[PDB]
Symmetry: C8
């Protein structure tokens, strides 16, 4: 029993470092995701001040894709968010980026803004990413 107690004593305090450090990392994670969430306004399935896609009854793309790409670069790298976010969150963002980026590449000599999307697979996939990404960000700080 005495031997077990001593082990608990060292294991318990030791766990003191984990109690103290784990906290510091959590606080950094909380800020990294708090600042990432705003990026989701571009991926919304509701109308907004900006958005990427506009609903009609359709699904026209906007040139706000340029704003999305710039906000994306700042949050993932310049603000350091990429460190505290999971591989799943990064994968979902990367796929979304390629869908909207691809759209702009096809537009080329874009005949004004607001361009109709005829392949609905891209539309449905963007909506699914929004839901999966919103959940992955929301639960990033909800594990305690």
């Amino acid at each position: 029993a005495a031997y077990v107690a001593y082990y608990y004593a060292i294991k318990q305090l030791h766990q003191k470092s984990v109690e103290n450090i784990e906290y510091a990392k959590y606080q950094a994670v909380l800020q990294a995701h708090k600042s990432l969430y705003k990026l989701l306004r571009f991926t919304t399935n509701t109308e907004n001040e900006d958005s990427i896609l506009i609903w009609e009854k359709y699904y026209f793309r906007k040139e706000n894709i340029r704003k999305f790409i710039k906000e994306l670069s700042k949050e993932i790298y310049n603000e350091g968010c990429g460190i505290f976010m999971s591989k799943e969150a990064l994968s979902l963002i990367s796929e979304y980026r390629n869908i909207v980026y691809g759209f702009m590449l096809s537009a080329q000599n874009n005949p004004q803004e607001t361009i109709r999307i005829t392949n609905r697979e891209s539309v449905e996939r963007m909506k699914k990413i929004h839901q999966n990404l919103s959940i992955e960000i929301r639960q990033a700080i909800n594990l305690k």
Copy 2:
């Protein structure tokens, strides 16, 4: 008894790390709701400097709906409030938004500001949302 004591010890400290993270999240929640509350001035059932609806004795809408939508976007996404608020609070805000947004869409070539509302269901629903939303925000930080 000794075996149980060890289990209680581990539960007790382990709970220490949870004691320090739950606190950090609470403080973030408190700030997220403190900054959201101001949005409620637009939904008030009393007279105010601005408001959306004006009482007369009929429930005329104001063009302050534009201020509401802009303040809404900033608080939910740019300031990160959407992370720390419940699904019920978001649902209530979304419904309210659609009622006032719809009103503006009907106005189109709006014949000046201050437009009468003839369908009282929208008026009564907006008031009920104000009460439910005010309570949901108020209790967000009142669970300890």
Copy 3:
């Protein structure tokens, strides 16, 4: 005894979360009321730089009611005070607001500033609200 010990331990530490979070909320309450108190200068029964009512021997209203309404909106909503204040404090403020607001609505084409009040019930009620509100704010942070 053993059952009480571990049961006592769960009741105790657990109370550790309440010991901390309760503290964080208290500090927010203290600031919310510290910033609300200044609003009371408008409701004073003594002379001041501004005030609403001026004593003579009377009770003339001033146009400083406009300053009161603007300060009121900022403190209750923009600064988030409304969250940390009781229903009684809000009820007292709301009644006061309606008394002074009503006065201004009656004035309409106001024949200059400083207008006599002939119905003393409003005068006595405003003074009583000042006393009740001053106490309700003062005791908001005095429960420990």
Copy 4:
């Protein structure tokens, strides 16, 4: 005696929770009085850069009473001092205010600054208030 052991412990841990709030309030009190003390320069019985009363050997009043009233309004209401100060401190300040305010009201078409006081009761009462107020402020933060 298990119940007895449980009692004292609950009283103590509960007292630790109360220990964390009493501290927070003390710190607010300390700042509220630190900023109030400067107001006393106007009530001094010694010569100063400004003061209210000037000694000669008679007790002439200065027009610095206007500075006193403005500083008084700011400290009691705008800075929130009125919350953390006792009724005795407020009573003493209020009486002083009325003595100097009354003086200015009598002056009316004031024949320049520096006006002699012929009723020595006001002079002696102002000095006594200075001493009582200086002590009441000084001891506000000296109870531990």
Copy 5:
């Protein structure tokens, strides 16, 4: 023994909140005296950039007395130092002030700066105050 235990516990924890508050006051005292010390440059018995008295072999007064009085008013009242300093420190400062103030009052139509002091009692008393005041300030924060 049992009676002392619980009685001892009430004496102990209770002291805990009081030990905290004592800490908060100490820190305020430390800052109040740190900012007061600079005032002593005017009372030095060595040469300096400014000083009040200049040594020659004499003891000529400078018009820097005006700087002293202004710095004195700011530190004792505007910065709140007067709260955290002892009666002895205030008495010593007050006497010094009256010696230098008196000198200026005698100068009247001052025949330029740098005026000789012929009564050496004032010179020796100012030096003694410097030493007593320097010690009283230095020990203000040295009691633990």
Copy 6:
């Protein structure tokens, strides 16, 4: 048992002080790497606003190498990152630097921007460094 107790106590508390310093260093490490991560945008294998290499289907270099070198100098030395990063992270950065630096040295009288790379070994090595460096930075703060 007694010998282990006091010996255990010396091992324990002693650690306790080490529980704090380890924490302070961790927090510094976390910030040093948070600010280093942004440097990785230059080494990405995806398209970006800037990047070094552009994908086509060939691996053309950009003159953004100048931005990379300047950002590198600031993060490693001026911001002090070099202290809190491992030898492996520094080795990987140094090799990358020499690959891109060498490229620029070969360009000399560079025939405009966007220059093709014909030796694919450099291309594949840069991609491998990106992956190894991204992991080494990511795990720098993940050891608790």
Copy 7:
């Protein structure tokens, strides 16, 4: 041991916040000396951007003595360093000051800058003060 228990416990706790206050004072001492150290650049026995004395093989004085005196006044009095420094540190600084000050007083109608020192006792004493002062400042914060 029972007698020691209660008395020992009171002595122990009592010490508790005295260790706290000791901490607060230490931190103030650390800052006071951190800001004093820079003053030593003037007393160096090596070449520098400024210095007081320049080595040649000599020992010419510079007019940088004026910079020394001004920096000295600011650090000892305006920044409050004089409180947290020992009598030995102050004595060493005072002697140094008088050596360089005396030099300037002898120069009078100074025949340009860079004046040779012919009495080597002053040169050797200044170097010895530098070493003693450097040690006294360095050890001021090294007693734990």
Copy 8:
């Protein structure tokens, strides 16, 4: 055992106060070295934006020695680094300074920038100092 207990208690708590002061000093040391490290860019054996020595295959000196001396003065004295750094770190910096300073003194009427070094002993010694200094700074904060 009883004697060891109370004796052990005096050894223990006592240490406890010191485990807060040791912490405070560590944090100051960490900052002092974090800000010193940047100085090493001048001593690097790799190419850089500035550097002192440039590699060719040689070892030409640059006039950036002036930048080195100015940065050196600021970090050792004005920022207070000299307090928290070891004698070995200071000795290594001093020797380096004299090597580069000497070089500039020999240059005199310097025939433009970029001057070849023909005595390789200075070149090899500067590189060795870089390695020894880099290690001494790096380990300054790595003893826990």
